[PDB]
Amino acid sequence: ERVAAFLKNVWAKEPVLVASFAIAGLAVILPTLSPYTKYSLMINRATPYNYPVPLRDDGNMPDVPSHPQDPQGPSLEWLKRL
Amino acid sequence: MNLMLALLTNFTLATLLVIIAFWLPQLNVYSARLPFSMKFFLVAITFLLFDLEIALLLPLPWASQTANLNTMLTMALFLIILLAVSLAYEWTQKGLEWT
Amino acid sequence: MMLYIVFILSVIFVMGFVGFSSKPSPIYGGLGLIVSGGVGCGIVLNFGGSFLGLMVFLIYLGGMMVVFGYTTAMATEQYPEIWLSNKAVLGAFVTGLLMEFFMVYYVLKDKEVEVVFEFNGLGDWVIYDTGDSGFFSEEAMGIAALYSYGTWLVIVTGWSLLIGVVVIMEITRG
Amino acid sequence: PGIVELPSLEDLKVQEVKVSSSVLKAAAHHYGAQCDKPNKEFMLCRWEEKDPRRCLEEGKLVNQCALEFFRQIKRHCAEPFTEYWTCIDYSGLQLFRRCRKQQAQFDECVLDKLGWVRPDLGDLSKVTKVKTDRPLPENPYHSRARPEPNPEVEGDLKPARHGSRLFFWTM
Amino acid sequence: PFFDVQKRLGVDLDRWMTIQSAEQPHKIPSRCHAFEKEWIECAHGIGSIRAEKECKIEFEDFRECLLRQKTMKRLHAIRRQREKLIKEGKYTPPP
Amino acid sequence: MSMVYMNIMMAFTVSLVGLLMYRSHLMSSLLCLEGMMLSLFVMAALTILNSHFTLASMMPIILLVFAACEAALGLSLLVMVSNTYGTDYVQNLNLLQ
Amino acid sequence: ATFQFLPDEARSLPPPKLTDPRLAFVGFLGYCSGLIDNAIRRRPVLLAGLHR
Amino acid sequence: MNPIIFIIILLTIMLGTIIVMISSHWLLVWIGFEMNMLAIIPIMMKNHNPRATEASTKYFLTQSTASMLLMMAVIINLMFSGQWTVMKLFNPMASMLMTMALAMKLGMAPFHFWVPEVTQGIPLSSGLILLTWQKLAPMSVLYQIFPSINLNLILTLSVLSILIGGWGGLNQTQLRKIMAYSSIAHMGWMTAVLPYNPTMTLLNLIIYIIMTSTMFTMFMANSTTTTLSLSHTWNKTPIMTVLILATLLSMGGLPPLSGFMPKWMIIQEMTKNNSIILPTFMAITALLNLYFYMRLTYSTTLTMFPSTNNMKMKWQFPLMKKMTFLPTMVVLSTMMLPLTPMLSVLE
Amino acid sequence: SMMKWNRERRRLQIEDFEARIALMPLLQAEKDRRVLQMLRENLEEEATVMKDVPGWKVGESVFHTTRWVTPMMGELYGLRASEEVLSATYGFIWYT
Ligand SMILES: CCCCCCCCCCCCCCCCCC(=O)OC[C@H](COP(=O)(O)OCCN)OC(=O)CCCCCCCCCCCCCCCCC
Ligand SMILES: CCCCCCCCCCCCO[C@@H]1O[C@H](CO)[C@@H](O[C@H]2O[C@H](CO)[C@@H](O)[C@H](O)[C@H]2O)[C@H](O)[C@H]1O
Ligand SMILES: CCCCCCCCCCCCO[C@@H]1O[C@H](CO)[C@@H](O[C@H]2O[C@H](CO)[C@@H](O)[C@H](O)[C@H]2O)[C@H](O)[C@H]1O
Ligand SMILES: CCCCCCCCCCCCO[C@@H]1O[C@H](CO)[C@@H](O[C@H]2O[C@H](CO)[C@@H](O)[C@H](O)[C@H]2O)[C@H](O)[C@H]1O
Ligand SMILES: CCCCCCCCCCCCO[C@@H]1O[C@H](CO)[C@@H](O[C@H]2O[C@H](CO)[C@@H](O)[C@H](O)[C@H]2O)[C@H](O)[C@H]1O
């Protein structure tokens, strides 16, 4: 109640500063609450700037595809449907 | 070369226009301290220091591509807040006044 | 030749330094530094430093040197003394140019000079990197890394700039 | 220091792929799917040997597979392909998104005539594994022997004999 | 450092920029990565007194990559001999 | 070394000599101080760029930022000196002999 | 170790005795500091502030 | 100054020093010096008078010039080694510049001219920071780059500082100038032993800081800045004259006082290295310092100078300055010789 | 609307980058031969210009190590026409 009548005063007298503090407050808080923030790291990771150097096949790499179109390896199906 | 040619043409043409402006047939036969406020000096210094912080912020469009987004965002917001803090300090210390 | 553009720029760079280091009126000394700053950007641009070069214009020339000129107009000079009207400035100015010219004349002729230390004269192009075909600016990648690797650099730099505001207000209060 | 060995001028001759960048750009996605095996064998060699002189034979097999790849487009899909890379070639940035209509015609032609399937988003950036009979390099950096470490100190820490022994002090 | 707080706390304040063979954005290598890498590994853990003599070969190679003073001196020598011979008409550059 | 290093090293020396050979205006010495920084920035950028030492690319910016903040402090002291004696001449700063 | 006042290996050594003559001297120096504290502030040197 | 701002500025001074002492990267070392200088100027200016403005200006120019030379050495080192690690330098020209840059920061002769003037022009509390805390950062760098330092250069700087500091102090009546020349002489001893045993540099540094802090604190307690002002202390605070007497004799290196220990340990290290002429010359030259310490003891403690009538009013009021840590510092300034072997904690 | 469009633009960038990755083996193979041809050509010129200079070995390395070392510009174009060197050196920086 004491804070409520404080906000009314600043809103009437310093609306520009109230907007500034509110906008800046949202910028610091919303990334922790947004459910899309995790896709920002995934998309950045998925972008291949440098060449993907192939590994030497030792016969003990069941999770490493032998060909780009093979079913092993990271997928971007989640990104297409994003 | 193209850019240097562009710059040369722009300032060479500027030089030519300025000299022909100064020349034409006229058809005629016959170190101290300014009385200037310290406030204006403080505007220049304040601009300079903020201009230095804007230099630190310019890389942000590239920095947003990093995979270390958690660190990137925290430091980006940290720099802007401190810039806001210095503005708040000047404001409360009567540094943005003219009376 | 165009292959020597960097060397040519570095020669002008030195003359600009002799210009303001002989210390004419700080109005002209500031002008000599502005020209050196612009040439300094040109040198940095030709080594692939696009972003770094433009920071010289934006920050060094458009920021610091504007304030230098601004302060000169208030607290140092309003009218300038005739350039080279002082014997000491002219003597220093002539002394520097001749030293610079003798350095340039010999290096060009021999493709190498020994001014105290050994310097080559084949051209700056010879030390350049030969193979490059990444799809990005490496110079831009490094500067962007300030926000992911240089957490410590940001904190201390950010703190120092805030302190600069506090300190300058204390200094000027009286 | 010695003499830098270099392969002979005729040890470097090969049939070059003399097509423009917009042709390669237009064919890149099918090219990456079709010529992966020699391509990855060559790139494995380069990152392992760190010496271009050591992968010249595998580099030649890269050209042969690419020339064979393009001879196979020229033999079945010449006209749909020319339309496509000519649309790519028009753009100053050689954008894919401006040519989806011509891309589909080329994609359908290779699929019908050569069973070629365009790799999906993300495929060509995968890290794959390669089988090579080339032995794994032993000393790729050609590094000398490392200096021996200093004699490590091991033992029981006893009190200093008679203390500091500084001038007259007894402790 | 005078006080090695970084090692003792296990926090990296500035070691990441100290050398050019450390991790870089997008694995971009420096031009002298292999030379610095070799010299660092030779000189690791033996002290600068020993390293100045026992890793001299690596440091000499590394310094050559950094400043290329020998390489330029050799090219300057071949350039001298050509534009001399060209005057005595004893050499004809290829097409 | 390369040609450019000759002239860049020379520019630093010229501005250093200029700084150590004062005239009258304090501003003239602050300019020589900022000329030294300019040549340092150019010398470091050239070295860092040529060697492709990527993470060091931010170093010249940090140098520029701190130096400019350092130049701001110098200008503040110049105006305070100028507010006391009416000029920025360094021969007025001799009370502490 | 690095930047450690007393590394772990130092625990093999016998501890200084609480009756160490050097430790008594250090205690004496502390007592002297207490007296000089009283003197500079013009308190009764011996009796003032026994807690201090 | 607002008390909160003063604390923040003091912490920035400390943080700038700490950054220098914990950095493994030359850029961060340079940043530490820049930060430290930025925050030290306001405390020199805090009384707003022309002498304070002159001192801050002379300080700014000297430190700024030195920091430029430090950066030049760092870049030359980068050119010839391709790395930024804080340690020995890899070019002799870089070593000379860095050594001269740090000598300029420390105020060693013949880059000493600023120390007496800046100290005289700033308050006693600012002079205390200038002549004690500000030595930590340059000395901590010298501690790490000493293997690459030119021996002739560093010993020449040391000998000149002991000579200049000793001779300069003889002509002084101002207490802040006396302390300034005392500082120059003591930096000379610290750097003379650096090539041989850096631990003795730290020992001399710490002991010097303790005694210098003691003297500045006792000068502040009575608001004395001149020899004659200090000669009134006997008729106000007799105890303080005894403490001043003991501390000055300690700073003179007289046994059995704490200030003998650093001179004694330094002589030992150089003799172990077959250096006999240099320690002997330094010890004899240090008698110049002992002379103008003794002069102060004569006017302060061992004789009673004339007083003034208005002094009787001061008898009625207590000493209300904080005098923080003075009882501890004065005891350590004088009575530590029996604990000399404890110098190994610095090893 | 900006989120939808920027997400699509990221997918388009990945497709463009993957096209580059598919071609890099072919471009890398071509580059190796070009560098080695240019070094072999410079060697033949050296063997003739310095054919009997007192004590001049031909093709001697300046490095103690035998590891392959990437040549710099001067070692590749050191004896070639100026316009090729301008284009090879400053061409990219000047294209703008
Ligand atoms: C143990 C190992 C270490 C060995 C090294 C030696 C350590 C000793 C040095 C300790 C540090 C100095 C502290 C000395 C304490 C002095 C306190 C004292 O004795 O009384 C001072 C006296 C009292 O004055 P006040 O209290 O203000 O009023 C008196 C009214 N009753 O004030 C007066 O009345 C003024 C009297 C006139 C001045 C006389 C000066 C000559 C006496 C000086 C003695 C101290 C000399 C210290 C040098 C070391 C001695 C060996
Ligand atoms: C929500 C988090 C988002 C991040 C925001 C970034 C941090 C920025 C920090 C700025 C701090 C400014 O803090 C501000 O200080 C002044 C002090 O005068 C206060 O204002 C007070 O002082 C002024 C004097 O000018 C009075 O007129 C006013 O009546 C009084 O309330 C404000 O109540 C407060 O808003
Ligand atoms: C005066 C100093 C002022 C300093 C102010 C600093 C403000 C910092 C505010 C936000 C900092 C972190 O901002 C955001 O927080 C959330 C908290 O989980 C992080 O976490 C979020 O993204 C990650 C990325 O995968 C997800 O795995 C996670 O599920 C999600 O919660 C974000 O990755 C980070 O971008
Ligand atoms: C005046 C204010 C003073 C306040 C001082 C507060 C101290 C702040 C400490 C900052 C450094 C924290 O510790 C450091 O943080 C960064 C980012 O999180 C980490 O760095 C991380 O980002 C990049 C990504 O590769 C790399 O540097 C490194 O691979 C990674 O670990 C370091 O691994 C960690 O050691
Ligand atoms: C206050 C004045 C400031 C002016 C600053 C002017 C810039 C100074 C540039 C110094 C950079 C060149 O520094 C110098 O380079 C050459 C080139 O290998 C080095 O090499 C030279 O000395 C050593 C001596 O054994 C050997 O390398 C070699 O015999 C010799 O050529 C020098 O040891 C080095 O000191």
From Swiss-Prot, chain A:
Transmembrane stretches, start-end: 16-36
Membrane topology field: Single-pass membrane protein
Principal localisation: mitochondrion
Protein localization: Mitochondrion inner membrane
Keywords, comma-separated and alphabetical: Acetylation, Electron transport, Membrane, Mitochondrion, Mitochondrion inner membrane, Respiratory chain, Transmembrane, Transmembrane helix, Transport
Region entry Disordered, spans: 54-82
Matches recorded under InterPro entries: NDUFA3 (IPR026626)
An example Gene Ontology CC term for this record: respiratory chain complex I
PANTHER family noted in UniProt: NADH DEHYDROGENASE [UBIQUINONE] 1 ALPHA SUBCOMPLEX SUBUNIT 3
Function description: Accessory subunit of the mitochondrial membrane respiratory chain NADH dehydrogenase (Complex I), that is believed not to be involved in catalysis. Complex I functions in the transfer of electrons from NADH to the respiratory chain. The immediate electron acceptor for the enzyme is believed to be ubiquinone.
Subunit structure: Complex I is composed of 45 different subunits.
Family the UniProt entry places it in: Belongs to the complex I NDUFA3 subunit family.
Protein's name according to its UniProt entry: NADH dehydrogenase [ubiquinone] 1 alpha subcomplex subunit 3
Taxon lineage: Eukaryota, Metazoa, Chordata, Craniata, Vertebrata
Gene (name only): NDUFA3
Swiss-Prot record, chain F:
Catalytic activity: a ubiquinone + NADH + 5 H(+)(in) = a ubiquinol + NAD(+) + 4 H(+)(out)
EC number: 7.1.1.2
Membrane topology qualifier: Multi-pass membrane protein
Entry-annotated residues carrying N-formylmethionine: M1
Cellular component per GO, a single term: respiratory chain complex I
UniProt effect for mutating V65A: In strain: 66
Domain of life: Eukaryota
Gene Ontology biological process terms in this record: ATP synthesis coupled electron transport
InterPro entries assigned: NADH_UbQ_OxRdtase_chain4L/K, NUOK/Mnh_C1-like
A Pfam family: Oxidored_q2
Record localization: Mitochondrion inner membrane
Keywords (A to Z) from UniProt: Electron transport, Formylation, Membrane, Mitochondrion, Mitochondrion inner membrane, NAD, Respiratory chain, Translocase, Transmembrane, Transmembrane helix, Transport, Ubiquinone
MF annotations from Gene Ontology: NADH dehydrogenase (ubiquinone) activity
Transmembrane segments annotated in the record for this chain: 1-21, 29-49, 61-81
Its job: Core subunit of the mitochondrial membrane respiratory chain NADH dehydrogenase (Complex I) which catalyzes electron transfer from NADH through the respiratory chain, using ubiquinone as an electron acceptor. Part of the enzyme membrane arm which is embedded in the lipid bilayer and involved in proton translocation.
Family: Belongs to the complex I subunit 4L family.
Assembly description: Core subunit of respiratory chain NADH dehydrogenase (Complex I) which is composed of 45 different subunits.
Protein name: NADH-ubiquinone oxidoreductase chain 4L
UniProtKB/Swiss-Prot annotation, chain H:
Alphabetically ordered keywords of this record: Electron transport, Formylation, Membrane, Mitochondrion, Mitochondrion inner membrane, NAD, Respiratory chain, Translocase, Transmembrane, Transmembrane helix, Transport, Ubiquinone
Record-listed E.C. numbers: 7.1.1.2
GO cellular component entries: mitochondrial inner membrane; respiratory chain complex I
Pfam annotation, one family: NADH_dehy_S2_C
Reaction(s) the record says it catalyses: a ubiquinone + NADH + 5 H(+)(in) = a ubiquinol + NAD(+) + 4 H(+)(out)
Location of the protein in the cell: Mitochondrion inner membrane
Parts forming coiled coils: none
Subunit structure comment from the entry: Core subunit of respiratory chain NADH dehydrogenase (Complex I) which is composed of 45 different subunits. Interacts with TMEM242.
The name this protein goes by in its record: NADH-ubiquinone oxidoreductase chain 2
Native organism: Bos taurus (Bovine)
Organism classification: Eukaryota, Metazoa, Chordata, Craniata, Vertebrata
Protein's gene: MT-ND2
From Swiss-Prot, chain I:
UniProt KW keywords: Acetylation, Apoptosis, Electron transport, Membrane, Mitochondrion, Mitochondrion inner membrane, Nucleus, Respiratory chain, Transmembrane, Transmembrane helix, Transport
Gene Ontology CC annotation, any one: mitochondrial inner membrane
Superkingdom in the source lineage: Eukaryota
Assembly and interaction partners: Complex I is composed of 45 different subunits. Interacts with CARD15, but not with CARD4. Interacts with STAT3, but not with STAT1, STAT2 and STAT5A. Interacts with OLFM4.
Entry GO MF terms: NADH dehydrogenase (ubiquinone) activity
Protein name, per record: NADH dehydrogenase [ubiquinone] 1 alpha subcomplex subunit 13
GO biological process: apoptotic process; negative regulation of DNA-templated transcription
Residues of the full protein shown: 49 to 144 of 144
Family affiliation: Belongs to the complex I NDUFA13 subunit family.
Function: Accessory subunit of the mitochondrial membrane respiratory chain NADH dehydrogenase (Complex I), that is believed not to be involved in catalysis. Complex I functions in the transfer of electrons from NADH to the respiratory chain. The immediate electron acceptor for the enzyme is believed to be ubiquinone. Involved in the interferon/all-trans-retinoic acid (IFN/RA) induced cell death. This apoptotic activity is inhibited by interaction with viral IRF1. Prevents the transactivation of STAT3 target genes.
Subcellular location, record wording: Mitochondrion inner membrane; Nucleus
Major place of residence: mitochondrion
Topological relation to the membrane, as annotated: Single-pass membrane protein
